[PDB]
Design a protein around this ligand. Sequence first.
Ligand SMILES: C[C@@]1(c2ccc(/C=C/C(=O)O)cc2)c2ccc(O)cc2CCN1c1ccc(F)cc1
Ligand SMILES: C[C@@]1(c2ccc(/C=C/C(=O)O)cc2)c2ccc(O)cc2CCN1c1ccc(F)cc1
Lengths: 183, 183
Amino acid sequence: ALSLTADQMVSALLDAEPPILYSMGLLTNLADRELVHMINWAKRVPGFVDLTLHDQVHLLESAWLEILMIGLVWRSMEHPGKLLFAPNLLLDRMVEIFDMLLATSSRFRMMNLQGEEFVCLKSIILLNSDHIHRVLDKITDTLIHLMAKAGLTLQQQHQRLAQLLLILSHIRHMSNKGMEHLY
Amino acid sequence: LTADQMVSALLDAEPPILYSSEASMMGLLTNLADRELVHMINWAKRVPGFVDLTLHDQVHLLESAWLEILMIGLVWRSMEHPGKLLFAPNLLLGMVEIFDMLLATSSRFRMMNLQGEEFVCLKSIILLNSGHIHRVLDKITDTLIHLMAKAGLTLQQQHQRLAQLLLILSHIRHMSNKGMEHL
Ligand SMILES: C[C@@]1(c2ccc(/C=C/C(=O)O)cc2)c2ccc(O)cc2CCN1c1ccc(F)cc1
Ligand SMILES: C[C@@]1(c2ccc(/C=C/C(=O)O)cc2)c2ccc(O)cc2CCN1c1ccc(F)cc1
């Protein structure tokens, strides 16, 4: 967990990955079926099981929607102007949240976000929304290595890591707007 | 502008510290916040790269960031005052939820031993992030790293500190959202 290397952290994350399911009622039914596979992914995040049930519940209640959003943004990346809710539910341009989702998707695309970098971002969201901080520092370590072992200079590595984490503020912002609509 | 010239430009741009029943409390807080907004606008004009932006882009960034800016400044003032919020030197104190979240942020920056130099960098990041811009944000990332390097942190600690700071901004954005909601 705190002893895992960069490669091992990515391997545990890429293999923890939930499947892509198929389909407001249609989106609610999709989101409910996605919840169950998210719980399974979360129990496979290194360090997450080393927390008590109530801390795990607290982290999932806060992160749930941002986790749905980031996966949606990722799977929609190679479909500009469209949100791929499911392979059978690709929606063209609550529309307030949708344009933000599209902008996050454009941003991730022009940055050329990698699958290994994505799964790292998903994990941080779950943990950020002493042990928790040590694991986050390990995910920070995991992130820099992928950029280092991609041909980026130490300056470009800190710049990409900044840009990536600043997108999480925008992801937090969309989840708040989403939670406002639901309640 | 160099990494050293950036910190100096920012530190000089710092706004002054202003002075200060639910309606009574809200009256005093709204009054202070409205006076602080005038100095925040003038501070924004001194942030390297901000005046290069169109007046339309300046308005949008400030409209988006204002409450995050009031909040980070509050958090930074309340740092060496545990369990209290330094709204003003004469004002050290259904809004307790946002208040307890602000106190947690204060404790976090205290734990982390946040430095004034880093604060002004975090404050500038918010203004540009919340709402060319990317190259300026990239310049503030270098600046934060250049300061972490000068304090004698290893390259590992340097990138771990960068991440630790930028993830607090997600929580700052979350606090502004709940606050904008209450207002
Ligand atoms: C459409 C939806 C969503 C998520 C949860 C629920 C549950 C409702 C309930 O419990 O009644 C419904 C829809 C979604 C669904 C599945 C998915 O993979 C990704 C996203 C992206 C974010 N999103 C969303 C939520 C609220 C908004 F205001 C705007 C967008
Ligand atoms: C108290 C207040 C605040 C900021 C803006 C206004 C504007 C009112 C209006 O426009 O009517 C009122 C209070 C504050 C005051 C001064 C300051 O330096 C920093 C902060 C940051 C946190 N904050 C806050 C806002 C909303 C909440 F729900 C909880 C807390």
